Structure formats: structure tokens, C-alpha cells
Design a protein around this ligand. Sequence first.
Ligand SMILES: Nc1ncnc2c1ncn2[C@@H]1O[C@H](COP(=O)(O)OP(=O)(O)O)[C@@H](O)[C@H]1O
Ligand code: BEF
Length: 855
Amino acid sequence: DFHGIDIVINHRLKTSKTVPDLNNCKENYEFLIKWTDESHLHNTWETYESIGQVRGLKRLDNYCKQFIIEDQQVRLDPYVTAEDIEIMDMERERRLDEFEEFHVPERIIDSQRASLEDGTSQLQYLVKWRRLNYDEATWENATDIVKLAPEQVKHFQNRENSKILPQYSSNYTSQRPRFEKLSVQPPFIKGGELRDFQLTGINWMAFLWSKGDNGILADEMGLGKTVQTVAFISWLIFARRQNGPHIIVVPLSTMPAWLDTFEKWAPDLNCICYMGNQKSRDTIREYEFYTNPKTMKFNVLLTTYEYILKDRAELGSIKWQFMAVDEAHRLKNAESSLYESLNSFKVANRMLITGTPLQNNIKELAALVNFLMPGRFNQDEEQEEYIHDLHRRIQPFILRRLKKDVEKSLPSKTERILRVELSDVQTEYYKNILTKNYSIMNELKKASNHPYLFDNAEERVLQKFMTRENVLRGLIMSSGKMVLLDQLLTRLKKDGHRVLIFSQMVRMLDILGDYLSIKGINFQRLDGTVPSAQRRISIDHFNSPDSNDFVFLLSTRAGGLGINLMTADTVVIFDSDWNPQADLQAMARAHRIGQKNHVMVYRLVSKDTVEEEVLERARKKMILEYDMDSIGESEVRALYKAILKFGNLKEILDELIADGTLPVKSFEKYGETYDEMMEAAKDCVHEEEKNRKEILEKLEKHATAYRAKLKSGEIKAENQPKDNPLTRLSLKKREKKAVLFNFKGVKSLNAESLLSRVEDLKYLKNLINSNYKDDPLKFSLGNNTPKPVQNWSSNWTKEEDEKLLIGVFKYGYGSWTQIRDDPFLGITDKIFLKKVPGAIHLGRRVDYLLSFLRG
DNA sequence: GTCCCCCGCGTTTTAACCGCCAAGGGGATTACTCCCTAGTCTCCAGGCACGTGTCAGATATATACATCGATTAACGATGCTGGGCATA
DNA sequence: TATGCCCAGCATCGTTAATCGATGTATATATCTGACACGTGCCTGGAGACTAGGGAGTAATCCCCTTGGCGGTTAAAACGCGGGGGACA
Ligand SMILES: Nc1ncnc2c1ncn2[C@@H]1O[C@H](COP(=O)(O)OP(=O)(O)O)[C@@H](O)[C@H]1O
Ligand code: BEF
């Protein structure tokens, strides 16, 4: 709640030497300081004497110290070169790129109208910013959000209008509907077009979904397995009416990719994922349900694997029906916490999208069999029968679509091995370790390709004297993979290719980080240490067509974790990571469909070592490649309110039923009840006129009979008789009754408001649609000025009359709960419940505006 | 910085120590026999692992009843305000 | 023509009644997990039964060791006095 210093944004000078001290930073430089408990849009250039003693001051002292050292490294040092200027100056634009992303929103979480100190109540939005966790979500008023990013406000209103709550979802658990194998594509792909095997896979998932069974999508990496999942979920929600919540577990590295693809292909569905640790959990819990002792405002989310094990009570207390997972190789063993954790969620159908090798161990395939079908089910001689029965037994429940059907638009594939010999350092480090001197088992396998893995190893090679070229010279010649890697790297640099290096050891990545940095090679690492905010900037920087990073380092599990590289084509592997097909899936992050200049792969096989035996063992595990017509009282009243709000409901009834008011009935019954209500209304008005005119005639006869006795002189003039036909006739002219009729128990139903409501709403639909159909925010009236206000505590002009009809045109009459919360009108502090703007007091004003426009 | 409880030291008072002799309880040795143990067999039922089963608590869950919160349609009485009718 | 007089006209205030929805409270039912008792099956580590032998019981004798009593010197414990130096605040 305190207004202290959070972080530092930018820095410059305030008043327009060898080393500026802190005093020069006080009386000579101003710094852009970001305050805590506040958005990044309130950054002010402050120093020390302008704010005084405030909470938090050491951060700016350390930042100013790094700025002093930076100034000592820009032009106040005789040892600086040329690349150091581009690096130190590159950090400036780097921090600017990491700070400008906090000013643009990305999502509006909630929208609660809070009161101020002057008594007014303004609607503030829970703004979510870009490249930031769910924390630090500040409330911003609706007076400047619509003036900066209207797409987030319009989409935020679209999430509330498109009511896809689970209470509207169908319940085909007792009987599945008739399924039809489609061939075309549904009009929901707004991103791009699809081929044939995508729609075939969708027809397979929906083909098996109608039978109450689950399958495994085992296609090739790159055939659009993510798009088929989003299209299958969207088609299942909007087709089979399955708007219920669907949990899709996605790793944290691929979560932003699935968010961008999900919003790019299906923008009509929200994608509120689950990230953070503590406060973000409170954000997801406060956004999950309402503060009451069951308001489902979500459906599709993304949960990381660790977030499942960390939070089992929050996710386990919610019902689910569909489960999707990318890279489902984590379920290799049936004795893990994730395997028993996913089986605890009461779901209905599952779907496994992965390509794990189900041939090296039977517990993997069997684990994937009993994972979705609990109950279903060695020697080399009986293996032909075991796979002869299990093969065709599992074929109807698996998709095996090879890449041979998509090679018509893909470049050729090739791979060349390279048996690299050892050197003298690898000989002494390969023989002298298992003797006497040390200076257990896996350390030899790790040191079978690079000696620099301990401590007493760099000073042993350096037999002379700080130098720089001698260290790198003694570093490249220590192993053959460095000399051959530098020669092949130079050969690829003579033409122009994007080369990748996949390594298992995390220390070798740092060794390459110290070797490639001296040679002037711009690159960026990617392992399991940096957070998503950094690796996402690195990958988004590598995907640029003008990127100068021709080398991009990865890892094994982190390298083949997810996402993809489109501009990469060359994949260099130091050694096999002790896993079959791990190299195929590792090259799958670069060798993809978007690549056009082919793919060249070099495997640095260590000759006469220990990795060739592991490679042979990996080849051994690779050769195996085998009531509807019933309308109750609440339906008559709710339908009557639907007529009072929307009028004619024979054209947008599908939108007036899915809102949650009208139950699931037949449209013909709504049409018949509507025709009977309107017909009985018109007939009741006609009878009301035929009888009312007769009553008026009787009051004219009795009134004349009273006047005949009044003009004679039989009535005293001292007291005027109030009980005469004249008074009851005058009160009959100003009668306080309406055309009422009881329809099927429901009493107090007016017929004039229905006809006049259809006329007013019809004149509004034809008036707005007959002039501005695709731009309702540009409708005008001209010179038609109605009567002024009657003592109102707010300014009201013609613009309020023009924008006031927009809310009635969109939401309808009587829906003042959405008009006061609409930021596209400007009447935020002009609609209340003591006060002048009332509910019916303004509605009758709208009726006066419509009656004024009709005349 | 103060006060009084220990050490050092001379003399007064008790009992430890050494020498001698006595007497008998109790420990040390021995011989014989007889109960109690290790050793050896057979047997299982005691015990170990595990599937199967209804009952403590705990968690909702469809259904019904009672009590408001708040909203909207309806009714009693106008207040200037607008649109026309008899007089300066 | 301007100024008081007749006839509507919506919004001002207040009050009644029907309705959707939230809150509180039962009430019999369908899961959830955690079992402790039983029967399933099997091992044999105990029980059961018998033998054989040598330890330990006891009894009968021995003689060493422990307790006792006594009296003479001769050091030791006991006492006090006095004042210094360590405890304690
Ligand atoms: N239907 C499609 N049409 C065109 N391109 C597609 C389609 N589906 C996927 N892609 C391409 O595939 C890339 C995404 O890869 P993706 O299939 O999501 O990886 P994964 O193997 O994790 O599913 C995108 O860059 C996109 O260009
Ligand atoms: F093969 Be995908 F990129 F997971």
C-alpha cells in the first residue's frame, strides 16, 4: 500500500569528467523511477532531493553504480575496443525492449466498479500486461484504456457476450448423437487454410469420440498436431454443444506459443492459462469463481507439469471431461507422481498427442493402454506372435501416418556421421584416471569427448605464460570435435547457414559460451536455467529474418522440450544423449516444414571410445518399428421479459436461448407461444377499445342526463356535488389502468407495451441498420432536438441522445446493467440507482426519444 | 569500592593406628545323584502377504421449505408546461 | 395582441404486490479412504515328544579370613583469633 521505489526504467541528465560520483548523479542526472504498487505508465523522472526519504533506495544506488562503471567502460578506459561499445550500448536497447513491453496491455481479467473519495464510482479494469506474470495487475480506470488499446476492451466484452458456460453444454453421456464423417472445413479457422490429413485427423478424433473411446495421436512432428487439437476442441464445443471446461496441460516453455496460436486460430475462445507461484495463484482463484459459498468464467487453460504436483486440491476439486497433453513421454513409467496424479482427475475422455518410441519397453505402450483404458493388456521367439496380436489389436486405436505422404512440398533429408579420433589429452585422461592419480564411471563417459571438465586441466596444457590467443589455441586443439567443428563452421560461414549445437552436458554449453564469444560469434544459449521471460525474448529474437545469431545453442530435454526453429537448418550433435529417437525429436526442433534450404545433420561420433556402444544399443531399439412442447410459468414470464427486452425473437432466437434464460426446448413451440401471445394481445386491445368506447358512450348519456338536471336549477350552487357522471368521466379520461390479461396463470401482462415495443425496437433496427450497419458509433440525428432535461445533476446534450440509443440497439431496453458499464458511451458517472438518473426514469426518457423520432 | 568470609598459625582436644591375641561364621572343596537342558525328529498350526468385505467419518448432491434483497409492474396526487379559449 | 382561464402530459414522490435470485436449513443418496477381520496360499520357525548327559543341587567337612577386644603413643582433628584479599555489587 506504500508508495515506494520498485525498479529503475531509464536514465538521463538533469543539468544541461574522469568519473562522476554520487553527487554528480544527484545534481547532474535524473533517473526514471518506477514506483511499486502502480503500473509502469506512472514512471516519473526523480532523483534524491525531489522525493526525500522513500521506501527502497539501495536499488537505485546499485543501478547508478553500474552506470558509473558503464561510463568507465564506454569512453573512460584506454583498454576498450569496438565490440564492447556495441555490447554495452546493446544492453541499453535491450533493457528498453524489456521495459516498453510493460506499457501495452494484453488482457483484461476482471472489471469491478470501485468508489472514489468524492462519492463517485468508476469502473476499473484488472489489466494484464505483456511479457509479465499474472502479478502486478493494477486497476486502471476505463477513461484511458479504451483510448490506448480498444481491441482488449472489445474482446473483453466479447468474452462476456459469448456465453460459453458449462450449464449450456449438452449431456450426451446417456446416448451419443448421430455422427457424420465430414470432408470440408468448418468456418472457424480464421488463421489459415488446412490440407487433407488435418481434416482426416479431426474426423478420426471425432470419429472415435462418438464411440466413447480414447485414442493416441502418434503422427510426425510438424504436421500441425497443435492446430488439430484447437480445431477439434472448437468444433467439439460449437458443434456437439460441449462448452464445458477442458483441461489441456502444456509445458511452460510452449505455453506462450500455444497462446499465440490459440488466439490466432480461435480468437473467440479465451485462453486464461495458469502461471505464477503465490499471488498469481490468488489471481487465478479470484478469477475462477465468485466470492460466494459457482460462476465458471473459463473453460480452456494451460497447466504446467509441476503446477499439477504442486496444486492437486485446486485442480482436483473441479470436474473435467477432456484432457490433452503435448509431448506425453513423461508417462514412461507407471510408478510416477504424474501418472497417478492425472488418473485422479474425474474426466470422461482423454487424448495423447506425442510420438514416443513404444518399442524399447513394453511398460510404455502398456502404460499408455491402461492409462486411458484400465483393464486391457519378452522372449524374441514369441515376439512375432505378441506383436502379431498386439499390433493389429492396437491399430484401430492409433494413428500411424508417416511423412511419405507430405514429402511433395518438403525438401530432401540427409545425415552424415563423422568418426572423430581422440588426442593425447583424451588418452592421458582416458587411461591415467583408472590407475593411481586423480587430480567414478559416468565421469569417464562425459570426459570421453572433452577434457575440460575438472579443475587441474587448463594450467596443465598451458606450458608458458594474461594471454588470449594461446588459451583459445590450446582450447580448440584439445579435442578433434573443436577443430573439425571450427572447420565445418567456417565452411558453413563461407556460404551462409544457421547451425545448431545440441549437447547433453550443461558445462560444455558454457565452454562453447567462452569459446564462441572470443571469435566474435553472436549467439544465445537455451538451457533449463533462464526463465520464460528470457528464453522467449531469445527465441523471438532468433526468428527474425535479419538476426545476426547464426549459432543457437540448445540442450537435450530443454532443446527438444518444445517450440520450433524455422530459420535453422544445420543440426550438429556432439554425441548421442543415451536415448533412441531423441536425436530425431531433437532435430525436429529445426528440421520442420517451414525450412526450404534442406537440412544438413552432422553426428560427431567418438571413435574407439564408449559412445559407439551406446549408439549401437540405440540402434538395437530402433529396428523395431511395428417435454420439449411443455412451457411452464417461469418460461412464460422469462419469455415475456425476453419480449420486453428484445421484442421480436423469430430471427435471433438461437442467441436468446444460449444466454441461459430460455430452457432447451423446440423453436416451433416458442413461435407458437409468441404468435398466441401477440394475437391474444391484439385481440385483447381490440376488445378493450370496443368495450371502452361503449363505456365512454354510457358516460356521455349519463353525463348529458346529469347536465339536464344541472342547467335546470335543481342543484345547489353552494356545494358542488363530486359524485356525478362529470367527475367519473373526467377521471375516466385520465384513467390509471392498462390493457391487462391473464395468459396461462401469469397475471399482470400488458398488451400495449408489446405492440409499441415491437414498433419501437423495429423502428430502431431498421433506422440504425438502414444507415449505419458496420459502424454504429457514427450514427447522428441531425436537427431533431427533444425537450431539455428536468433538473438533472449531469450535463446532457445531443451526443448523449445519439450514444444512448446504441445501448438499446445492442443490449436492449431495460438492460441498464450493461449501459452504465459500457466505456464506449461516456456516461460512466451519469447512471446510478437521492439520485436523479433512475432505472425507469431514464427508460421512459428513451421511450420519449423513440416516440419523438417516430413522429 | 566495600565487607566478611577463608587462609595461616598457635594451642587444645579426640580418636586414628599399630600391635597383639581370640573365636567363630562363612566361605571354599569335595562327593553324589537327579532334574533340567541341548540336540534331534515331525508337524503346522502360528505367522507372513494379500484379495475381499461393509462400517466409521468426510464430501458433496438432488429436492424441498422458510426468509428476505432487490427489481419491476401497478396505483394515488400532483407541477409546471404546452395548446388553445373569454376579457383589457 | 397580451393576460388570465379550460384541457392534456410526463416526471416528481410515495406505497403494494408478483418475481428471480441469494442465504439458511434439513433429508435421504451416491462417492472417498481407511481400514480391521477372514480366508486364500505357503514356510517352518515354533511346539510337541523323547533321550542322554552333564550341570547344578545339596550335603558334609575344613580352615582361612574377618571381626573384636584391648590399650600408647603420637599425629591428627578441632578451635579459635586475626586480618588480609577475594567475592560480589
Ligand atoms: N494448418 C496449417 N497451415 C499452415 N501452417 C501450419 C498449419 N498447422 C501448423 N502449421 C505450422 O506449424 C508451426 C507450428 O508447429 P506445431 O505443429 O504447433 O508444433 P508441434 O509439433 O508442437 O505441434 C507454425 O509455424 C505453422 O506455420
Ligand atoms: F514436434 Be512438435 F514441435 F512437438
